[PDB]
Amino acid sequence: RLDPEYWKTILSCIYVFIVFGFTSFIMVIVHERVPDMQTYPPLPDIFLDSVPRIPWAFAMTEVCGMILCYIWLLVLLLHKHRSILLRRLCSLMGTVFLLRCFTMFVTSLSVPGQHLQCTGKIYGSVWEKLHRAFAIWSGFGMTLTGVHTCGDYMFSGHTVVLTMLNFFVTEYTPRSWNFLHTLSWVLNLFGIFFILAAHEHYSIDVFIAFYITTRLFLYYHTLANTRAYQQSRRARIWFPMFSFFECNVNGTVPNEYCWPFSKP
Amino acid sequence: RLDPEYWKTILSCIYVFIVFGFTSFIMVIVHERVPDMQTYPPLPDIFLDSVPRIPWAFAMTEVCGMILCYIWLLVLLLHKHRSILLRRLCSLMGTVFLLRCFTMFVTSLSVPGQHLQCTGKIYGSVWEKLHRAFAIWSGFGMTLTGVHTCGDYMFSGHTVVLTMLNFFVTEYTPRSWNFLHTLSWVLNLFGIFFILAAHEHYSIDVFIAFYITTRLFLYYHTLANTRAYQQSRRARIWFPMFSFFECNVNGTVPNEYCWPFSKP
Amino acid sequence: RLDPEYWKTILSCIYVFIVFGFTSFIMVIVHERVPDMQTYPPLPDIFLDSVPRIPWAFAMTEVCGMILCYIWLLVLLLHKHRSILLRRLCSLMGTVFLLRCFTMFVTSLSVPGQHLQCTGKIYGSVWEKLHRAFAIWSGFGMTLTGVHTCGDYMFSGHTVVLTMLNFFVTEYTPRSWNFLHTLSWVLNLFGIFFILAAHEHYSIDVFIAFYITTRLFLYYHTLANTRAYQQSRRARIWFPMFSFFECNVNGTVPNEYCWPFSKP
Amino acid sequence: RLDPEYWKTILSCIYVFIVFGFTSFIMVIVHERVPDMQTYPPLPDIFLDSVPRIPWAFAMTEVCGMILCYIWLLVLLLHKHRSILLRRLCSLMGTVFLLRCFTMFVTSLSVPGQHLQCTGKIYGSVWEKLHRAFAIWSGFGMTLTGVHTCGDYMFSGHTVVLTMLNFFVTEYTPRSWNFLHTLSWVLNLFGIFFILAAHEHYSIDVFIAFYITTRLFLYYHTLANTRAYQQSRRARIWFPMFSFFECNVNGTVPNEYCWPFSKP
Amino acid sequence: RLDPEYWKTILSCIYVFIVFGFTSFIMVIVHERVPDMQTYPPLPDIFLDSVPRIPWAFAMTEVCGMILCYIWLLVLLLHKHRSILLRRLCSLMGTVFLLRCFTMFVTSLSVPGQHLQCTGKIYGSVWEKLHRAFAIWSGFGMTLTGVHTCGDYMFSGHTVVLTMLNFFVTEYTPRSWNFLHTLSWVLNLFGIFFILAAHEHYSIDVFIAFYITTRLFLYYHTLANTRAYQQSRRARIWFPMFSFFECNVNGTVPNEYCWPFSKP
Amino acid sequence: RLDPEYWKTILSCIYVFIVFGFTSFIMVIVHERVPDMQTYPPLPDIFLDSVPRIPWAFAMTEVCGMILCYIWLLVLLLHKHRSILLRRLCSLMGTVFLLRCFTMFVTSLSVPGQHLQCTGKIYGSVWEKLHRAFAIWSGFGMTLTGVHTCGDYMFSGHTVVLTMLNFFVTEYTPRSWNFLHTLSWVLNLFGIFFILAAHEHYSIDVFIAFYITTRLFLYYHTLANTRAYQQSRRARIWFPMFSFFECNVNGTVPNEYCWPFSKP
């Protein structure tokens, strides 16, 4: 019997925002490793060399995300298990972004020549980096609300968020509506494809970004359904704060829908 | 009962050899795409920037390759199922190295500046790229038998070979010999330390090459020991020609050793 | 049953402060043997010759030491039988630091050349050696609050404290927390590594300090769990004040946790 | 049942000879590090400063060693299970000398000023270091047949041999002969005192050598008597070639004495 | 049952005092026989000829005397049969010192040359020999309160007192305290080494005085513990009025302790 | 059963002869530490100061020795078990004489002025010392066959031989012949008294000699009758080769007489 925990989702909600600030701080520090990073010519890519750069191609990437999260917002609203759905999204987005920091600290791979006119540079001090980090944190990295002036590094987060939201939408709906599922899938592919057409991330930048989110999503649900957190000392699951969130939930979550408002 | 099939092993051994030649050939094609790739400054790193270059560290990586191969050859001869072990080795190196070809064609990445004096280049025709391919193919990519004259590309194969031969040694010996397993782990780690200290491959090319082989190794034997190729249509295995190779075997291969010669 | 003795622990806490004062006096007598101990050329070591001196490496060891002290303090606050744990830590640090005084008097082995600028010296009298011993005594020997002005001698005390605290954290916590157990081990090995990297002790001064604390901790616990202080006359236990402290404790101390304050 | 294995003692003797040769070579290499090692002022010791040097105090140690070796050989002659006794001494001496090599490599601690007149030195090449190692090997390191011409390093080997021979003489004699035991103990302590009084080693070197030999002997005999090599997977015994030698011996070796000669 | 008698103790207590004055009085008489006793060269020895004189080694003997007496006084207070213990102290010390007076009169032996400077001498009459005897009697022969200013004769009394107070401490404590017993043995041996190192008594003076007290102590307790005074006419006890002192006690005195004060 | 072994007597007889030579060898070395020892004045005694020197007092002291052993020889000649008495004389005289060597090495006490005309001295060599020792060995120390020309040291052997012979004659006769026992006792005192009257040994020289022989005699017989060599591990009797001689003898020996010859 699952117990709706309205106090644990608060801890899960706080956890994801702390990781968001940490990632913004890291990308500022790694930015000053090399001063210029606009003189190199782009590496030979099979995709970035054929299609010409489209300046407005990236502008539609977050457009699909807004529709995707809006659709996900409604199914969250019309789902009775509001604590579990929100807590399983914050406990996964907070894990992938930690893997984003590790893979960009060891090496830095950007696109040499696009968005070459972003100003700032030589942030040599202790305190003025935080002001830049604060803008990154409370800007969502959007280009409409211009904060991300020039390009980003390996393991792009635009693919992470687009793919992560798609999987919750697809399988948290009744298995008889195979018309919305293909609508979510087609939007995700165009968003990923538009990233490459904007000459902002390499071809290998997205492939390992799409694989990590997909593998981590399936590994989490399989262990949640099998209920291995207390069945046996199998492998000491390495997910950050996993058993603390799934201890009160046993079995597979149902998909019963109702109406929250008391004014029909 | 496990029936030794000596005619399928011959076909599998041919399959893996075709991959090496095909993989070597595309190395010339991608090298022709870039004029030099030996002038640019290296991208910022965490390990290639701290330690200085060690000229003799590249040879020590392949010195440990013989030890792992020599031990594996000894284990192969003293195993009753010689046709079974050799078929999986040729069926795994064929798949992993096939992915190496794919990741090289989609994106090109190398460390800019070591081994910049390799001669030849600009082989513009059809009738000497094979000549260079044959020289590399019939040199096993070693540096002692110098064929690998200058730089290599992303997803280094010097780590795939070391890791694959490390897991076969531990897997196919009795589960009480955990000292050779310890020795086979020290050799693998040192072979990875020296390939990085020699300034030959980035810190991220090694990690994504130590993970793919490990993941593809456990997944292959899990599918075998569980025997899911005929129990049920679990996932429609994507391994190239997996149902053909392992159809005639049932259960798990034991770990008892025999002697083929009749002169004790 | 475990009877919390609040009068034996006070005797155990006093016993430590006598030993620490005694050790702080021996370090003054030993320092007067050799006048200079700063002109000799250093002995040929394998770790002190490769890694160059890191100026900030010794201030980081005590940073890793305070964190282990903060974690241990929380364990002592939330434990049912906090009296016995406090009595066992004070009964073990008073024994190892007695072995440090013995090996320092028998032979003096310092590092010839760091802290060569420390002034003072030639305290030839009885009346100010006690003053010098008090300065080291009420500074805990730490390098942050400047007391450790000159060099240090054999059987490093920094390694004894770090290893003793680390083994207490992983012993008196539930055997399902294999992330704090791994975190403490990481903090222990980095604290030891920064002692060698700061050129503060030889490679053999730290190895035998880590061994003795590890051996004496395991021996003490395997001797009290089997209630060997009264089971028979096995070997006439040589631990200082062993039967006096543990005669009221029978069997193994459980791992019950509670909250002492009555204000939820 | 105790089955006398006559084909393993040869392997043990070969292993010991290889270990001795490796120790001689490592000693030569270590001595090659520091050129002079004879101009330094000696460290302040408590035994090397009080008792003045005795010129003849180093031959008495080898006299006691030869007496103990003769007694041990006499014990070996009239024992039923002489093969097992000969197989146990070698497997312990090899391990202790490997530990000696390891502790000699990390740090070099010699006595600065005895044998300052020894000539030779600066053997810089590969071709005569082997000759010097062969001389030290087939000179047994003794001072009677002059090979020990220059100084000696940490973890003295005379104390190891004396303690091992004394412990083997005490162990495998009937438990009613408590006068030969006292004689052997007196010989061992006199040998140690004569090593210390000849200004050949520091006090800490002798103390750690004695402790290590005693602890290793006791641990090995406890493991052999408790029959832990096949009882369970207790700790994966780290003794080199332990389970290979004692697998044919079950229980504790009795103390039956006989006469191998059939000519009364 | 043991009945403590407080009347026999008073009579036994004054027995030693009349003997102590008699022992002091006989010293001047034997001293008057030979005038100088401070000019001849010493007899050949094995210990007085190797080690040199240590001026402060004579005081350290009596420093250890206070500790043995201080511990014994504590035992004599926290005991329940305090009347029994003190009677045997006066009964044994009186007999041994009575022999000490006898052995000087039959033969006089001393160390020729130590303490040659004492003034006075040639006290030929009856009315100041007692005065000199009273000075030693009221000074207890100590050197801190200097009355024993120059040399001592056969059968040194510094060994009798140290050994007698050693055997009462170990015997009249519960047979589980074998650490104070170990301390009481180290305290005795050091006192025996310092009296010899001060060139105050020959190497045979100590041994024939360490044996008589030990033999006379073991004989007294075995003769009493087995209760041979009234069981049968075993040997017609030669001890001075041994039967009178121990007639009222049967069996062995237990080792239980009481507390006389009524203010816990 | 009292089994007479004629082969153990020979081993016992050889043992006493080796000690006889060893004692003579010590006498030569001990004489050389002091050059003269003939200038000192004799120590003031209670007996040597009154009784004048008698030149013929030592003439007849050995005469009693022949008479005493002649009577003992007749008792040995007319005993049923001659072997057991012979091994109880050699195994007891061979222990006392070893105690004579120990007391002469630690100190040297002789009479300064008698036998002052002894010649030779200063035998500084390695080889010709034995000729002096050989004369002492094969001279039985007799003053008639003059070999022992010069003075003698502590623990005179003249009292040892007289007392040991006296006790064997006494208790190895039936307990109804208390007329010869008095005669043997009378001879012993006169022989001892003349030794002290010959100004050859001090008063304390003989008393310590009389006690040691008597105590060791009674301690041997009590242990032989009690049969403590195999009854229990009581005290590990310290007599040399004691259990080896009494293992085959059970109980106490009777005193029956017979005739050895077969020709009445």
Ligand SMILES: CCCCCCCCCCCCC/C=C/[C@@H](O)[C@H](CO)NC(=O)CCCCCCCCCCCCCCC
């Ligand atoms: C609690 C779950 C909320 C998840 C919603 C997305 C949050 C992620 C926003 C940035 C996270 C900070 C760290 C990433 C920094 C950038 O290096 C990163 C990679 O280029 N940019 C984005 O993620 C660009 C973000 C692309 C996301 C578009 C999908 C639609 C989300 C809209 C919700 C945000 C409200 C703002 C509406 C205008």
Ligand SMILES: CCCCCCCCCCCCC/C=C/[C@@H](O)[C@H](CO)NC(=O)CCCCCCCCCCCCCCC
């Ligand atoms: C019994 C099974 C043995 C199979 C062992 C692996 C065979 C792989 C043959 C590779 C032939 C060329 C294809 C690779 C081209 C390079 O882009 C690649 C990465 O730089 N280099 C290597 O793989 C070469 C790296 C070499 C380092 C590993 C050393 C172990 C090799 C063992 C084979 C011994 C044969 C040596 C004969 C000279």
Ligand SMILES: CCCCCCCCCCCCC/C=C/[C@@H](O)[C@H](CO)NC(=O)CCCCCCCCCCCCCCC
């Ligand atoms: C039973 C209580 C244990 C508490 C922690 C251990 C305290 C032991 C301090 C030793 C006192 C002086 C005796 C030794 C002197 C030196 O020869 C010795 C070796 O160089 N120094 C240390 O051990 C110095 C090593 C210091 C590393 C430990 C750091 C943790 C200190 C915690 C105290 C926090 C107070 C901070 C207030 C600002």
Ligand SMILES: CCCCCCCCCCCCC/C=C/[C@@H](O)[C@H](CO)NC(=O)CCCCCCCCCCCCCCC
């Ligand atoms: C299983 C065989 C055990 C036999 C006895 C032990 C042999 C070990 C000899 C080691 C050979 C050289 C390696 C070590 C060299 C030195 O770093 C080391 C101390 O400095 N030497 C010894 O320990 C040398 C110790 C010397 C003291 C022992 C004396 C007994 C020797 C018996 C041989 C008799 C031959 C005599 C012929 C004239």
Ligand SMILES: CCCCCCCCCCCCC/C=C/[C@@H](O)[C@H](CO)NC(=O)CCCCCCCCCCCCCCC
């Ligand atoms: C409670 C029972 C205590 C009885 C302890 C024994 C009492 C012995 C008193 C000796 C009286 C004079 C006779 C001895 C004369 C000297 O030729 C003799 C040897 O040279 N010296 C000692 O015996 C002197 C021995 C030196 C060693 C010190 C041992 C004395 C400790 C007891 C006295 C404590 C008084 C302390 C007051 C400050």
Ligand SMILES: CCCCCCCCCCCCC/C=C/[C@@H](O)[C@H](CO)NC(=O)CCCCCCCCCCCCCCC
């Ligand atoms: C196991 C059989 C033992 C029987 C008797 C053996 C006596 C041996 C005594 C001398 C042995 C040499 C070691 C001692 C050397 C001297 O430092 C020692 C002390 O002065 N001399 C004597 O004891 C000399 C004291 C001698 C007194 C009489 C001893 C009885 C001897 C009877 C034999 C007479 C044969 C004479 C034929 C010419």
